[PDB]
Amino acid sequence: ADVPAGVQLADKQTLVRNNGSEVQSLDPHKIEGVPESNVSRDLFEGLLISDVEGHPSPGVAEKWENKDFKVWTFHLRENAKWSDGTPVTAHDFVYSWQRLADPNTASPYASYLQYGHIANIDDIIAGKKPATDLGVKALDDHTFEVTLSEPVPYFYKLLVHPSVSPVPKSAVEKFGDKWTQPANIVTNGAYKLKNWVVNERIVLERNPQYWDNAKTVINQVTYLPISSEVTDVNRYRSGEIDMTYNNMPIELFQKLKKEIPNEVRVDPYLCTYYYEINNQKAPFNDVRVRTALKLALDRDIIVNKVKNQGDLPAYSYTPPYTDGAKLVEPEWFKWSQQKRNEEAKKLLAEAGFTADKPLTFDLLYNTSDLHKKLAIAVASIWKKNLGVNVNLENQEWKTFLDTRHQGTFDVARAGWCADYNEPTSFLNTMLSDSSNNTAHYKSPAFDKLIADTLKVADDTQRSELYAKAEQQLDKDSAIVPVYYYVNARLVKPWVGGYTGKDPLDNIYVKNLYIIKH
Numbered sequence: 001a002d003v004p005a006g007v008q009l010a011d012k013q014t015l016v017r018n019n020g021s022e023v024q025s026l027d028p029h030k031i032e033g034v035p036e037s038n039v040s041r042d043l044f045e046g047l048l049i050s051d052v053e054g055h056p057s058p059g060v061a062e063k064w065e066n067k068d069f070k071v072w073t074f075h076l077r078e079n080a081k082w083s084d085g086t087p088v089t090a091h092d093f094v095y096s097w098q099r100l101a102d103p104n105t106a107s108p109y110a111s112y113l114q115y116g117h118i119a120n121i122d123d124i125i126a127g128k129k130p131a132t133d134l135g136v137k138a139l140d141d142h143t144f145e146v147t148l149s150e151p152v153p154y155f156y157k158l159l160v161h162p163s164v165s166p167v168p169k170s171a172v173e174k175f176g177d178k179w180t181q182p183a184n185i186v187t188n189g190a191y192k193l194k195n196w197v198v199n200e201r202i203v204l205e206r207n208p209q210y211w212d213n214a215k216t217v218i219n220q221v222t223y224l225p226i227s228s229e230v231t232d233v234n235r236y237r238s239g240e241i242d243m244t245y246n247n248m249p250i251e252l253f254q255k256l257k258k259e260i261p262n263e264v265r266v267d268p269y270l271c272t273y274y275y276e277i278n279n280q281k282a283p284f285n286d287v288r289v290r291t292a293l294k295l296a297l298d299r300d301i302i303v304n305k306v307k308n309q310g311d312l313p314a315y316s317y318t319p320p321y322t323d324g325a326k327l328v329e330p331e332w333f334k335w336s337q338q339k340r341n342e343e344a345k346k347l348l349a350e351a352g353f354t355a356d357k358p359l360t361f362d363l364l365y366n367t368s369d370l371h372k373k374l375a376i377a378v379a380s381i382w383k384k385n386l387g388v389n390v391n392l393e394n395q396e397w398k399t400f401l402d403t404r405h406q407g408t409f410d411v412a413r414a415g416w417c418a419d420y421n422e423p424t425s426f427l428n429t430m431l432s433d434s435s436n437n438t439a440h441y442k443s444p445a446f447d448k449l450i451a452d453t454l455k456v457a458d459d460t461q462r463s464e465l466y467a468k469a470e471q472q473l474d475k476d477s478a479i480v481p482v483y484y485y486v487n488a489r490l491v492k493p494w495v496g497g498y499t500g501k502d503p504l505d506n507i508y509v510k511n512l513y514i515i516k517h
């Protein structure tokens, strides 16, 4: 943390943050969500990290170079250490990235190494080559070298993500799935795991072995798993919680902005809210059905009337303000909702649906006051505008993610937030073979458009190809875009260091501090 001259620090430097739900895991190769990543950043540190405003900056790697954007060499700082005092080396990274690639690990982020194009990854994921053939090597204890199969100018931006953080081989091998228990875990970020009570709390304490430990201010941070946004706000206002999670309750938001305006932080966020259609399941394998659902949803009502927190109506998957996005707004987005509804009803009529044999399916969402209110609104809109019936179903966060991976669903609410600020952070997740593809969408034309983006060595051709990739996704109605998120949360006046400038919201508790109050 960089405490400004003249600020007086509180005697007790502890922080309590709400974190939305119980995490899937603390193992960096088994996680895929925001709640998980929030804790991961305080515990595991990769080659690069985001600074307080979001810029890619030195992590374990203090400096790096590239040859032709294809061979990347990372010089690791000599004092990087794990919490047990052992050095962090390039061998930790070789083992870690191989473990991420290995199909036996079944990482939901195994495809992250395809997004960076590390050599031999396709073959490794397919089981044709062992994970030890991955294009990584330790040239020495402090030098990690990555070889890509084609030039990737933005490759280093990918490296702040939890999937490419190191994991401690000896703990993994000795304890298997219990390596992340407090008595067994070993970490290399600014914090160490002190306590982990499922469905109650996660408590982290400063890691004195962290190389940048002299600059860490917060000595302990607790992450809570509260999925009720009302309860989160209530426990913030009662004094228990210093930072809420960033899901705000429809019941209280407008009142909160009038009551404690300086605490309500609302900033740009590179996430898209959408309804994920299971593309492989009848009748959702019919484009007419997907298009109908997409069109009949009234984004103005959802965004301006039901949520009303500053989000923007969406007509794409990639947010239009992503660095490198120059998207073309489809004509259907400029039609009236009435015209959208007529087109929707006609397509369902064409698809074989009638008043007597209507379209009925499930709408799955992770337990939440906000997502339940949004799902109820969407259900009513779809009923009214299109004559479709939906059965709402809630599931705890971890189970919800697994259901979508299993494809044991019809439609599900969903949010994707960038991992790196570049359109492929979104678009690569719709590739046929992507491990993050829970839409179960498979388009050879879409796959080709993205594949062509690294075959050109020009930004304008790349941007035009992303725009066309979004047009292919839209033409196929792979998803139902709802809105581009704003990042809205409550933050006590005494929490310093949170700028709100990072559009990815990659917060590190090592960068915060408690002002005397």
Ligand SMILES: [U]
Residues within 6 Å of the ligand: 011
């Ligand atoms: U004190």
Ligand SMILES: [U]
Residues within 6 Å of the ligand: none
């Ligand atoms: U106090």
Ligand SMILES: [U]
Residues within 6 Å of the ligand: 153, 459
């Ligand atoms: U470039």
Ligand SMILES: [U]
Residues within 6 Å of the ligand: 153
């Ligand atoms: U650049």
Ligand SMILES: [U]
Residues within 6 Å of the ligand: 323
């Ligand atoms: U940029």
Ligand SMILES: [U]
Residues within 6 Å of the ligand: 361, 362, 410
């Ligand atoms: U269903």
Ligand SMILES: [U]
Residues within 6 Å of the ligand: 230, 251, 369
């Ligand atoms: U509620």
Ligand SMILES: [U]
Residues within 6 Å of the ligand: 517
């Ligand atoms: U106080």
